[PDB]
């Protein structure tokens, strides 16, 4: 599923991400835009052999099991394919674990490089929330 901007903001809000660990909703929407272009089915392979999955591009070296990343942890205890569902629940629950691990949203390279320090509230402007 490819979400609309306000549709995803609403779904993320209902799943408890607004101000989760101090990150306002616009941060999460901005990160999803530049990680996946709002497409739950997005995958990208990394140089080290791991793969990134879903709307928030969660990596198989640490967070999910895809059966082909040797020596990986499955810290969210989920198959990586579950992160590609039109239902974002599994991506949201795993992202909450990631953002709590010490580095905040800096774990998402596109957030650091394209969202951090910008007017992220613009990503939810106009939405009925
Ligand atoms: Cl915001
Ligand atoms: Cl980047
Ligand atoms: Na929308
Ligand atoms: Na893994």
Swiss-Prot record:
Disulfide bonds join 6-127, 30-115, 64-80, 76-94. One of its GO terms (cellular component) is endoplasmic reticulum. Lysozymes have primarily a bacteriolytic function; those in tissues and body fluids are associated with the monocyte-macrophage system and enhance the activity of immunoagents. Has bacteriolytic activity against M.luteus. Belongs to the glycosyl hydrolase 22 family. Its main location: secreted. This is Lysozyme C. InterPro entries: Glyco_hydro_22, Glyco_hydro_22_CS, Glyco_hydro_22_lys, Lysozyme-like_dom_sf. It catalyses: Hydrolysis of (1->4)-beta-linkages between N-acetylmuramic acid and N-acetyl-D-glucosamine residues in a peptidoglycan and between N-acetyl-D-glucosamine residues in chitodextrins. Monomer. GO terms for molecular function: beta-N-acetylglucosaminidase activity; identical protein binding; lysozyme activity. Lysozyme C is capable of both hydrolysis and transglycosylation; it also shows a slight esterase activity. It acts rapidly on both peptide-substituted and unsubstituted peptidoglycan, and slowly on chitin oligosaccharides. The gene is LYZ. PROSITE patterns: GLYCOSYL_HYDROL_F22_1, GLYCOSYL_HYDROL_F22_2. The active site is at 35, 52. In the egg white and polymorphonuclear leukocytes. Substrate binds at residue 101. SUPFAM superfamilies: Lysozyme-like. The lineage of its organism: Eukaryota, Metazoa, Chordata, Craniata, Vertebrata. It comes from the Eukaryota. It is found in: Secreted. Residues 1-129 form the C-type lysozyme domain. Keywords: Allergen, Antimicrobial, Bacteriolytic enzyme, Disulfide bond, Glycosidase, Hydrolase, Secreted, Signal. One of its GO terms (biological process) is defense response to Gram-negative bacterium. It holds the Pfam family Lys. Its EC number is 3.2.1.17.
